[PDB]
Design a protein around this ligand. Structure first.
Ligand SMILES: Nc1ncnc2c1ncn2[C@@H]1O[C@H](COP(=O)(O)OP(=O)(O)O)[C@@H](O)[C@H]1O
Ligand SMILES: [Mg+2]
Lengths: 31, 208
């Protein structure tokens, strides 16, 4: 399982507008 | 600068000018069995290689809508090309997309992961959407495409998307278009929509 920070997520939403959370992604090995 | 990712095929790489480019969306069109998925798997491995081997020392993101992503196919490609397959698998971030809304959601999260991986030893250099294929539905797709364009540009990544054809192809705006078809004796033919490459699908993935 792969994690992502709330900060990077916030940055991502701001980018498309015009500490750890669930990413929805995992490695091809299942992590 | 513009980076390039080898497809594993000398012939294919030449048609594309050296491999799939970053800061751009490359679209592949073809009928069922044409090799779009196999090429997406090959690239997910090729991108991980140093630039001397035709990669970008990066990682790949794979959004799958056809439930055709196979980690064991990745293993075969890696093992056959002489790479540690456990490591190749670790460097592919995979998400299965159940509907259009979900796909869009995964794009926001994939973007968040790109931000975080920026300036590390192995940032995400490739994003695969297999497969791309009501008033709202057309609108959603357009929005999805715009987001992809912004991702390619802001994060210096290569975006690879696949389209299933049921000749006169309706491609999306501002993309590099490649048309795949079956040739003679397992060979596949590639040609740019806007002269021709011939390649095979082998235990190494895509190659001449
Ligand atoms: N391990 C493998 N080695 C060689 N060829 C394979 C392997 N797995 C699948 N193929 C072949 O690759 C071709 C392309 O399949 P695919 O990429 O799924 O096409 P599409 O996505 O266009 O439907 C098929 O003809 C299939 O038989
Ligand atoms: Mg497919």
């Amino acid at each position: 399982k792969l994690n992502v920070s709330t900060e990077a997520l916030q940055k991502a939403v701001k980018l498309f507008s015009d500490s750890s959370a669930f990413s929805g992604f995992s490695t091809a090995s299942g992590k | 600068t513009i980076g390039r990712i080898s497809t594993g095929s000398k012939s294919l790489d030449k048609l594309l000018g050296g491999g799939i480019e970053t800061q751009a969306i490359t679209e592949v069109f073809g009928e069922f069995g044409s090799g779009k998925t196999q090429l997406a798997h090959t690239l997910a491995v090729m991108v991980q290689l140093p630039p001397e081997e035709g990669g970008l020392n990066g990682s790949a993101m794979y959004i799958d809508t056809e439930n055709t992503f196979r980690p064991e196919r990745l293993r075969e490609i890696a093992q056959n090309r002489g790479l540690d397959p456990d490591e190749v698998l670790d460097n592919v971030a995979y998400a299965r997309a159940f509907n259009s809304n979900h796909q869009m959601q995964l794009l926001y999260q994939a973007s968040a992961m790109m931000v975080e991986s920026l300036n590390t030893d192995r940032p995400y250099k490739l994003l695969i959407v297999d497969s791309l294929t009501l008033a709202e539905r057309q609108q959603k797709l357009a929005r999805f495409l715009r987001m992809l364009h912004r991702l390619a540009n802001e994060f210096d990544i290569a975006v690879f998307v696949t389209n299933q054809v049921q000749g006169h192809i309706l491609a999306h705006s501002a993309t590099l278009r490649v048309y795949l078809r079956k040739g003679k004796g397992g060979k596949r033919i590639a040609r740019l929509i806007d002269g021709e490459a011939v390649f095979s699908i082998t235990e190494k993935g895509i190659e001449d």
